[PDB]
């Protein structure tokens, strides 16, 4: 019955609650770079600006990919409303109480590991779409799953450029991550599965990769 | 019978008088850039490139961000012609008479106010063109109207790379300057009245917004 | 029966031997660049990703210019693999015995010429591909053919970033190279073919302009 499992697990509404779990860390994460606190109180606009890369800036590569508008994903009113609101909420909340609440290690290991869920399933869906365009597409699933993963690693060289950082002496392809690293093999994995040579059913890749994503994630969250 | 003056107000022809004072107005802003007379001489190519993106950097922006053809309307021959004439006359015009007569105080506030018609008219086109394609993407409209108004400015990082200038220390989104920040208060209030929660008609948010921009726009010329 | 030996040489397929050259002599450059030796090794995928901007660059400035997807032509994997293969036998082949054979001078001259004829052909398609989206778009026709035979030429201050290099004091359009300005006279040339102001044939221009650069080339090559 592990197919049954697998099957409630690879198909959980990742809104609004998985959803947010994903602004909560990226924002948090945005909020530990060099300077952003103060971007936050003289440059306001460019602050949430920034926010919404790091909160969609697997939508937004994706969609640049494939030819589609890189903020098509912003049509999703609810979604950028409730970005915004874990934004401001990070940033400006008063006595900083929903950063110190969410900044609570076992707090901040379950939006970890609910950020790995919508990772997963992201990169499962970047493969299913550009497949749809391209049956036989094999690099561009494989291009449009591994953005879709990363996020806004791959486009860290501009995203500090908005906050007026230049550093060209590296990037996310010339020296990839763990999470810019997995998911490359996460797209190579869920590429396989979609040219049936992977014989294994999507929703059991999903809850493998998953759980591996999650194990890892939480380990190194907790370690630091 | 203000509403019978508005709507003959919003719907002058902008081609070509009214874009003509935009070209200039915009080649005139280039010619005044650090090494902008030196890269007409040495670049000629570039510098007509650069000279384009300050006249339909606007354009450029809009159709990026929707996912369509960036050069989409180089298609219009006479638009094109037209700002290549203005870039010439400009900075090969002999006695640089062109340059002495549109920059005369009282012919330049005149192209400094017909500017101001066609980028309220832009941003007002930009939130209905996005609102066709998404009838209820309020960001994308936001973010569409903001560019139309914003033009070359939101690309000014990349404007002075091919110039050869990098200045990453900051950018019109960082630090927002006058133009850039009107057009964003400009596309909130054209997409407000999209949503008909500001009520007010179309044509009369573009007399009163045009009149403020003309104003503003006029004042601070003639003050500098 | 010249038109009959024209004919001939403008419809020889490019895919695989003609692709190959051009495959062959764009990562020949690649490894003249500095530190891609040192790249090839510690960052194996970004090397592989450098070779692809090489071998495939003029579709992917075309496809982002007429506002298509820029990894559109990688759903053509004989193509990739190809190019993956010439990529891994310069920069892995054991004795880098593949490097010393088509470096060898009159090996490499032979490559040289049959890239042009990659390149023209190249430059007459992007102004036939835009033609067919644009029937009176010229400058469309220009800016799609000049990037189609310009190619990673274009980008080359991002092929840098890609590397970890930052030289933003010049560029391809401050100042172009030969194969940059011989393109933008090619584009010129079958855009006033396709406007039938040109009066001549299209395979009469590829033989005439194809034998213009690949004289030019072998020149060029066989000189230093
Ligand atoms: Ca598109
Ligand atoms: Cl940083
Ligand atoms: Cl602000
Ligand atoms: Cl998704
Ligand atoms: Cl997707
Ligand atoms: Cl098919
Ligand atoms: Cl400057
Ligand atoms: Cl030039
Ligand atoms: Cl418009
Ligand atoms: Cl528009
Ligand atoms: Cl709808
Ligand atoms: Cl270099
Ligand atoms: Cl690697
Ligand atoms: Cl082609
Ligand atoms: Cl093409
Ligand atoms: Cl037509």
Same mark, same amino acid.
């Given at each position: 019955?592990?197919?049954?499992?697998?099957? #409630?697990?690879?198909?959980?509404?990742?809104?609004?609650?998985?959803?947010?779990?994903?602004?909560? !860390? $990226?924002?948090?994460?945005?909020?530990?770079?060099?300077?952003?606190?103060? &971007?936050?109180?003289?440059?306001?606009?460019? %602050?949430?600006?920034?926010?919404?890369?790091?909160?969609?800036?697997?939508?937004?590569? #994706?969609?640049?990919?494939?030819?589609? %508008?890189?903020?098509?994903?912003? $049509?999703?009113? %609810? $979604?950028?409303?409730? #970005?915004?609101?874990?934004?401001?909420?990070?940033?400006?909340?008063?006595?900083?109480?929903?950063?110190?609440?969410?900044?609570?290690?076992?707090?901040?290991?379950?939006?970890?590991?609910?950020?790995?869920?919508?990772?997963?399933?992201?990169?499962?869906?970047? !493969?299913?779409?550009? /497949?749809?365009?391209?049956?036989?597409?094999?690099?561009?699933?494989?291009?449009? *799953?591994?953005?879709?993963?990363? *996020?806004?690693?791959?486009? $860290?060289?501009?995203?500090?450029?908005?906050?007026?950082?230049?550093?060209?002496?590296?990037?996310?392809?010339?020296?990839?991550?763990?999470?810019?690293?997995?998911?490359?093999? *996460?797209?190579?994995?869920?590429?396989?599965?979609?040219?049936?040579?992977?014989?294994?059913?999507?929703?059991?890749?999903?809850?493998?990769?998953? &759980?591996?994503?999650?194990?890892?994630?939480?380990?190194?969250?907790?370690? /630091?």
């Amino acid at each position: 019955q592990l197919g049954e499992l697998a099957a #409630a697990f690879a198909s959980v509404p990742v809104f609004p609650l998985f959803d947010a779990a994903y602004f909560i !860390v $990226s924002v948090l994460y945005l909020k530990y770079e060099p300077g952003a606190v103060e &971007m936050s109180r003289k440059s306001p606009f460019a %602050s949430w600006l920034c926010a919404m890369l790091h909160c969609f800036g697997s939508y937004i590569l #994706a969609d640049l990919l494939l030819g589609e %508008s890189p903020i098509h994903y912003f $049509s999703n009113n %609810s $979604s950028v409303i409730l #970005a915004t609101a874990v934004w401001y909420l990070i940033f400006f909340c008063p006595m900083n109480l929903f950063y110190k609440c969410v900044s609570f290690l076992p707090v901040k290991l379950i939006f970890v590991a609910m950020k790995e869920v919508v990772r997963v399933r992201a990169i499962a869906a970047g !493969v299913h779409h550009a /497949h749809h365009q391209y049956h036989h597409g094999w690099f561009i699933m494989m291009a449009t *799953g591994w953005v879709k993963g990363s *996020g806004v690693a791959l486009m $860290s060289n501009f995203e500090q450029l908005l906050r007026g950082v230049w550093r060209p002496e590296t990037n996310e392809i010339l020296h990839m991550s763990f999470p810019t690293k997995a998911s490359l093999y *996460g797209t190579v994995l869920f590429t396989l599965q979609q040219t049936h040579w992977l014989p294994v059913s999507e929703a059991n890749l999903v809850f493998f990769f998953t &759980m591996f994503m999650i194990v890892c994630k939480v380990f190194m969250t907790a370690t /630091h």
